[PDB]
């Protein structure tokens, strides 16, 4: 479960998720990549589940590059509690996903196996996906 080793502040503001992903949309560490087409939030457990599925199905015949890291803490109030009395505690970490953001790259495996593994991985993600390949320009 990826989590930052250290942080300056324990709790962060909610914010808003807008715009497109002009950075991180280019395949740069491998041959074949899976890229999100809409926006949302990706959790650490979802990242781990997708990675485990991909690795199991490719049988560790190539290299997987993970290009999402959860660095935004999320807090929830415990339960049975009224409104007020300060902010809640951290329960899990997430990563913001914008359309065009690359999630996983695969290098060293054949296109059929990589695509089929990505198809398996897509069934666990909470947003739509697509498959891209390295290109010249």
């Amino acid at each position: 479960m990826l989590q930052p080793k250290r942080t300056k502040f324990r709790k962060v503001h909610k914010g808003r998720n807008t715009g497109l992903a002009h950075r991180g949309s280019t395949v740069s560490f491998g041959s074949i990549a899976i890229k999100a087409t809409e926006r949302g939030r990706m959790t650490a457990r979802q990242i781990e589940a997708a990675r485990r599925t991909i690795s199991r199905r490719i049988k560790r015949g190539g290299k997987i590059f993970i290009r999402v890291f959860p660095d935004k803490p999320i807090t929830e109030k415990p339960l049975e509690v009224r409104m007020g009395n300060g902010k809640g505690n951290v329960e899990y970490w997430v990563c913001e996903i914008k359309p065009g953001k690359i999630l996983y790259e695969i290098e060293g495996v054949n296109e059929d196996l990589a695509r089929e593994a990505f198809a398996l991985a897509a069934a666990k993600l909470p947003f739509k996906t697509t498959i891209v390949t390295r290109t010249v320009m």
């Binding site: 497109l20 992903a21 002009h22 949309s25 890229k35 087409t37 359309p99 065009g100 891209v132 320009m137």
Partner: peptide, 12 residues
């Protein structure tokens, strides 16, 4: 000669 190309981040 082609020098640069811009592609849509999502639709490509």
């Amino acid at each position: 000669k082609i020098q640069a190309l811009q592609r849509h981040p999502a639709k490509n």
